Ligand SMILES: CN[C@@H](C)C(=O)N[C@H](C(=O)N1CCC[C@H]1c1nc(-c2cccc3ccccc23)cs1)C1CCCCC1
C-alpha cells in the first residue's frame with residue numbers, strides 16, 4: 734500500500750501547495766496530480782505512495798516525467814501512467 738495513505742487524496746495534496754514558491758514555473762495542479770505533496774520547506778515535494786522526494790525544481794519540469802525518471806518502480810505512477818510511459822522516459 735501507500736507509504737503515506739493520508740495524502741492519497743489529490744485535493745488534499747493540492748491544498749498542501751498553498752505556500753508553493755514556484756506556481757508559474759511548476760504548477761501545483763500538475764504536482765498534486767502526479768502524486769506529490771508539498772513538505773512546506775522550500776520547493777521540496779514527496780510522493781504519497783513511494784515516499785520519493787524531489788527538490789530543486791527547474792522551470793518547465795514535468796512532475797510525471799520526473800516521477801518516472803527518479804522513481805520508476807512506484808505503483809501509483811504505474812497505475813496512473815502505465816508501463817509504456819515509464820519505459821519511454823528511460
Ligand atoms: C531538475 N528537476 C528536479 C525535480 C530534480 O531532478 N531533482 C533531483 C532530486 O530532487 N533528487 C534526485 C533523487 C533524489 C532527489 C533528492 N532529494 C533530496 C532531498 C534531500 C533531503 C530532504 C529532502 C526532502 C524532500 C525532498 C527531497 C529531499 C535531495 S536530491 C536532483 C536535485 C539536485 C540536483 C540534481 C537533481
Ligand SMILES: [Zn+2]
Nearest residue numbers: 780782783807
Ligand atoms: Zn511515487
